[PDB]
Amino acid sequence: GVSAYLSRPSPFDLFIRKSPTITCLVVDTVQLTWSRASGKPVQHSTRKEEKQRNGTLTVTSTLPVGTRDWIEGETYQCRVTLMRSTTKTSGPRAAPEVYAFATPEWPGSRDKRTLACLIQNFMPEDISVQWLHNEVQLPDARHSTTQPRKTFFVFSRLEVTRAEWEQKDEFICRAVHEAASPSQTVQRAVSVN
Amino acid sequence: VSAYLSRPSPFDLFIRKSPTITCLVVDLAPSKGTVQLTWSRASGKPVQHSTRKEEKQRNGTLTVTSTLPVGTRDWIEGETYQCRVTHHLPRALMRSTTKTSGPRAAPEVYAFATPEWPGSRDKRTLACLIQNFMPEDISVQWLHNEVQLPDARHSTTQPRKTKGSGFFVFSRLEVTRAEWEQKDEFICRAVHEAASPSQTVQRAVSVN
Amino acid sequence: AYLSRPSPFDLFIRKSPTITCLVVDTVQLTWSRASGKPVQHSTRKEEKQRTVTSTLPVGTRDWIEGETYQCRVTALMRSTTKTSGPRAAPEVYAFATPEWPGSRDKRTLACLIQNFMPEDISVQWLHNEVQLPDARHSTTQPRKTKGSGFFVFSRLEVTRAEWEQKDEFICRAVHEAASPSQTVQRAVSVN
Amino acid sequence: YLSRPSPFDLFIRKSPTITCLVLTWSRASGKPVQHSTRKETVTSTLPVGTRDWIEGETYQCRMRSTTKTSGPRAAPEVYAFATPEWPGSRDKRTLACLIQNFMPEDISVQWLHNEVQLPDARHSTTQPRKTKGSGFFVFSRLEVTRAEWEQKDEFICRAVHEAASPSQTVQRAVSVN
Amino acid sequence: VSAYLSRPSPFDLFIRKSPTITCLVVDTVQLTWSRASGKPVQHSTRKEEKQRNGTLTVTSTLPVGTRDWIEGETYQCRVTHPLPRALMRSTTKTSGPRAAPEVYAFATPEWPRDKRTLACLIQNFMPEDISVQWLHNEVQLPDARHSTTQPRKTKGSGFFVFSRLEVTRAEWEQKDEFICRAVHEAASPSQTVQRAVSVN
Amino acid sequence: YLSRPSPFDLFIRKSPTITCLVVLTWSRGKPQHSTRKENGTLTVTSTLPVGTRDWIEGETYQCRSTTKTSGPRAAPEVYAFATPEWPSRDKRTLACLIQNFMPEDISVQWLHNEVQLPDARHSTTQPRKTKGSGFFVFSRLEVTRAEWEQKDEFICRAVHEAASPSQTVQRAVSVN
Ligand SMILES: *[C@@H]1O[C@H](CO)[C@@H](O[C@@H]2O[C@H](CO)[C@@H](O[C@@H]3O[C@H](CO[C@H]4O[C@H](CO[C@H]5O[C@H](CO)[C@@H](O)[C@H](O)[C@@H]5O)[C@@H](O)[C@H](O[C@H]5O[C@H](CO)[C@@H](O)[C@H](O)[C@@H]5O)[C@@H]4O)[C@@H](O)[C@H](O[C@H]4O[C@H](CO)[C@@H](O)[C@H](O)[C@@H]4O)[C@@H]3O)[C@H](O)[C@H]2NC(C)=O)[C@H](O)[C@H]1NC(C)=O
Ligand SMILES: *[C@@H]1O[C@H](CO)[C@@H](O[C@@H]2O[C@H](CO)[C@@H](O[C@@H]3O[C@H](CO[C@H]4O[C@H](CO)[C@@H](O)[C@H](O)[C@@H]4O)[C@@H](O)[C@H](O[C@H]4O[C@H](CO)[C@@H](O)[C@H](O)[C@@H]4O)[C@@H]3O)[C@H](O)[C@H]2NC(C)=O)[C@H](O)[C@H]1NC(C)=O
Ligand SMILES: *[C@@H]1O[C@H](CO)[C@@H](O[C@@H]2O[C@H](CO)[C@@H](O[C@@H]3O[C@H](CO[C@H]4O[C@H](CO)[C@@H](O)[C@H](O)[C@@H]4O)[C@@H](O)[C@H](O[C@H]4O[C@H](CO)[C@@H](O)[C@H](O)[C@@H]4O)[C@@H]3O)[C@H](O)[C@H]2NC(C)=O)[C@H](O)[C@H]1NC(C)=O
């Protein structure tokens, strides 16, 4: 009934911002407790609480973790009152392949165009996908990325309006991956016309 | 013990003309007895014979599925089908499924081909964006020489709702040089109840 | 001519019972009590159709203790009083329809209220701890069960914006045999 | 008074009748009326043609007239419920049926058990009342015994309506447990 | 070169109970029928016609099963000629919600005598497939006596057509009742709805 | 393809245009400025204004070839109709029948309180041939209670080159 998940830091937050966070998610007052397997101190975590439209209550705790602490292999635990653990992914690494496409205009969509990005063949599954226009990152809510499925690959989708591509007809799909070289960034550009 | 009940795939419903629903029982720990999967219709009208299937998983968990043929007119005109799971366990489990309601919108199909990737010049990936369809049920096949490729050859994402109403899926197909040099045409075809005239929309993509 | 009893809602919840004399054809509706004790002022409404109605406030204690009120129309004579006999509290059952094709933002809630005696019954629907307007629902007039009780059905169309705000709707029957505050209720949720 | 055929007589029995309740019968098209059955309140029941009624034939009794209701059509939605066990009544259960959003208002409701139609007096159905939008609704109530549901725990509420498809019937089953 | 594949008329499907579909090629062409289910297909009737504009018209009329069509079967027509690639046309039962047609019939006033015009508005039906017949003295008039507009989508979801029937005074003096009748899969219960109209 | 000016533009507006559709140069020839507008197949349209008198004089324009069609003339007959109140009292469908006009070029408008309603308010069929001489068109207009309470009169108007006196024929219909 009451599910619990614990995610790893975003690759964009972990390698670029150097501000990694892990998130413990509880899906139906429950209490969440952070703890480290080493015993070292956990930082103060932010806790959020939101009632969903299906009557579900969702509790999310976001814990800041040390960048070196995460890469050194620390194991963090989330205790709900069921306990979850998260640690870095081991295993082989591989850079991602990025391809960006632009749809032709649908018979109706004369002033809106859809951009798609395929990122595939990367290891492990942890990846961040971003869309940029004029070197400024777009709001995350404007694009929708699938979770990685084993061949790992993700698809990203971004609808752009006529005002944007007429301002500049160039949109960058950027993948931030642990195995991406040389700046943990592999990106592609695409144009509407 | 968890139980799920699917709807017919648009392919089975509109192309194969053999729609089926599947009651999937995932038993976190197999016990001793034989779980009972009983089919019924909310109208009280008869159901057909179902196929039962049991398979123990590598995590020591038992999986029991029952597949029921449903009448094409019956399903389309809004019949509700019911899977009753008697296991042991405390109370009986009851799942039901019916056609999804709401506005209808045909899918838009866009088929792309990734340019050649260094380190593998015999592989090309084909991507298909299918979007702006309502409701969410959709089937995707990839055709070569007007013949349908096996389903395991392609992956399709689960439908997601767009900015407005409407859904989208991506379909990915890895092809080989032997296949595109034999003929450089590949059909991404989407099967959806709202497509006209025969519930299919398709687009041709070429590797070059 | 018809002469109704106070609704259990007005009598027990609002604590302001009234009775209504309806004549289906000026006329003279002289209100009186069988005891000869005074009656209050009444309202009067005459409506030409393609009928004269008059509503009299009555005392709560006066009604509960068995006073008989009379509507003489001039000659038509109708009287009303507290029904007497066996009392039985109402059974309350509330149901939600499943989602019907072509309208996923609408659900109908149904309430069966049965096996109560006497037949005087009121039904309220509550959502978000507060009473929905009476016009939101319809309720059948009491019909005799197979045994000696009565039953009504109450129907309430609800919207997705309401059950996503709070997925709980209460069907509340007001009846004199309900212990101890003259109400029985049952909650129904859409999912 | 002059009634229209019940949807059960019209579409299930296929012998529809109209009754003039207080007598000569006539059709607006001038065609003859069948043999009338007079019964002494005095009523006259006239058999009508099924195709004739559906085609909008106007029958008159004397003067009162009747014809099938015009306007839009809509199939009924059916939902069947069973009440939980009530304390002190372990061997009784009440079944309820909500039939709604149909147009026009003429509708026939039956309850079946083992595909055997229970007698009319076993149940009570309200008269059609208007919904909040367009369309009508009725409620049907059926008390059932322990012996009935222990023999087969399935009861069918069936609605007969002109606009229902394919055979002018929509039904729902309900079980006690 | 273009090809068209029609659905059965509601009249053939529901009144005649002999539904057929037509494959119409316009400019020696070959036409092949099949079913998406793979089930066999009956024998087709082939007809060619020379037109005034010098273009040939080849038609293939295929009888289809009544229960097969109603169950949602898909039928296919394939055309081949000297054209680059084969033309594929497919047809099946129309989907979506169903609504019976609403029929209303008008009689026009006399224009500034020997002839009067009757109009029939049939609207708010789904899907778009509809047949319109005119009756007089309980017998159907020849189809050539009237003309029916092609279905156009109304403001809501439904469709409408108009049907126009010229009548002579010798006809309404014999009897002054003319029946406009729509055949439609959603009409109940016998797939027909009708309205009578008089000149006076 | 090459289209002729609509009777509305020719008579009501007095600024006729022709459109060349390619699924491009204009010639008469005597002496106007052109306007161009851009399934997988691109469709291009170019709209050229023409002099009113010139098209009346029988001038032949080319992109194929178009000109004022010669032939017999016949004015349109107009009948306006209102459906009965449906069992939806805030909406009424209005119908109009235009018939027996030659040639087939015709324009149909609905007017309310002397203002032409937007074209998308009504749905008008293509000119179909009748049994005798002339064509016919049907026009359908859904109206609302707010419209007829302000003025319960709706004009169905046909613009046709053979209509007299001023190329218009109209009939008024009321809801109540
Ligand atoms: C009532 O409604 C509520 C909704 O209001 C619903 O609650 C949902 O419940 C489901 C299931 O219980 C939840 O789904 C789970 O969510 C887990 C957390 O998801 C977050 O984290 C994901 C992991 O992030 C890491 O990995 C990614 C990928 O590399 C990386 O980018 C990150 O930086 C990080 O490293 C993340 O992928 C995910 O983001 C995707 O999805 C969200 C949509 O939720 C979207 O906004 C994003 O843009 C992106 O597309 C998200 O940020 C998740 O880990 C978990 O996934 C595992 O399990 C599923 C099986 O369920 C597997 O299929 C999957 O492959 C993974 O193994 C799972 O998906 C969901 O989060 C709840 N929603 C909310 C808002 O709380 C209730 O269930 C409803 N009740 C009922 C009865 O139905
Ligand atoms: C031991 O190992 C076995 C084998 O993997 C695991 O069994 C799996 O359990 C999961 C979770 O119970 C099952 O996932 C569910 O599958 C349902 C069926 O989906 C199939 O069919 C549909 C259409 O017919 C396809 O689209 C799909 O790809 C599958 O082929 C889904 O309907 C379920 O989704 C619904 O429920 C979930 C949970 O609430 C929601 O998140 C979804 O959004 C949706 O509402 C669900 O995905 C899986 O099918 C099982 N596989 C097998 C082979 O049995 C055991 O779980 C595992 N044991 C342990 C303890 O880990
Ligand atoms: C030389 O002259 C001949 C004789 O007229 C022409 O043949 C016609 O060609 C046109 C196409 O150019 C055909 O038009 C199409 O007809 C299809 C068949 O319709 C049947 O069913 C309808 C009822 O729904 C009947 O009214 C009709 O008579 C037929 O029985 C229609 O399905 C088509 O309409 C739909 O599709 C098109 C798609 O482009 C849309 O534009 C339409 O609006 C509509 O959505 C279409 O109308 C016509 O049927 C042919 N008639 C005959 C007798 O053969 C030649 O075209 C002509 N050649 C040249 C070069 O001019």
Residue numbers in the entry:
A (entry chain D): 335 to 362, 369 to 421, 429 to 498, 503 to 544
B (entry chain C): 336 to 422, 424 to 544
C (entry chain B): 338 to 362, 369 to 393, 398 to 421, 428 to 544
D (entry chain A): 339 to 360, 372 to 389, 398 to 419, 430 to 544
E (entry chain E): 336 to 362, 369 to 423, 425 to 454, 457 to 544
F (entry chain F): 339 to 361, 372 to 376, 379 to 381, 383 to 389, 394 to 418, 431 to 454, 456 to 544
According to the publication:
IgE plays a central role in the molecular and cellular mechanisms of allergy, and is a validated therapeutic target in the development of new approaches to treat allergic diseases such as asthma. It exerts its effects through its two principal receptors, FcεRI on mast cells, basophils and antigen-presenting cells, and CD23/FcεRII on B cells. The Cε3 domain is thus the critical domain for receptor binding.
The new crystal forms of Fcε3–4, P1 and P21 ‘small’ contain three molecules (six chains) in the asymmetric unit (solved at 2.2 Å resolution), and one molecule (two chains) in the asymmetric unit (solved at 2.26 Å) respectively. A remarkable feature of the carbohydrate attached to chain D in the Fcε3–4 P21 ‘large’ crystal form and chain F in the Fcε3–4 P1 crystal form is that while the terminal units are well defined, there is poor (or absent) electron density at a contour level of 1σ in the 2FoFc map for the first GlcNAc (P21 ‘large’) or first two GlcNAc units (P1), as well as for the covalent connection between these and Asn394. While this has been seen in other Fcε3–4 (and also some IgG-Fc structures), it is particularly marked in the new Fcε3–4 P1 form, and this prompted an analysis of the relative B-factors across all of the Fcε3–4 and IgE-Fc structures, comparing Cε3 with Cε4, and also the Cε4-proximal and Cε4-distal regions of Cε3. The B-factor analysis revealed that the Cε3 domains showed greater intrinsic flexibility than the Cε4 domains in the unbound Fcε3–4 and IgE-Fc structures, despite the range of different crystal packing environments.
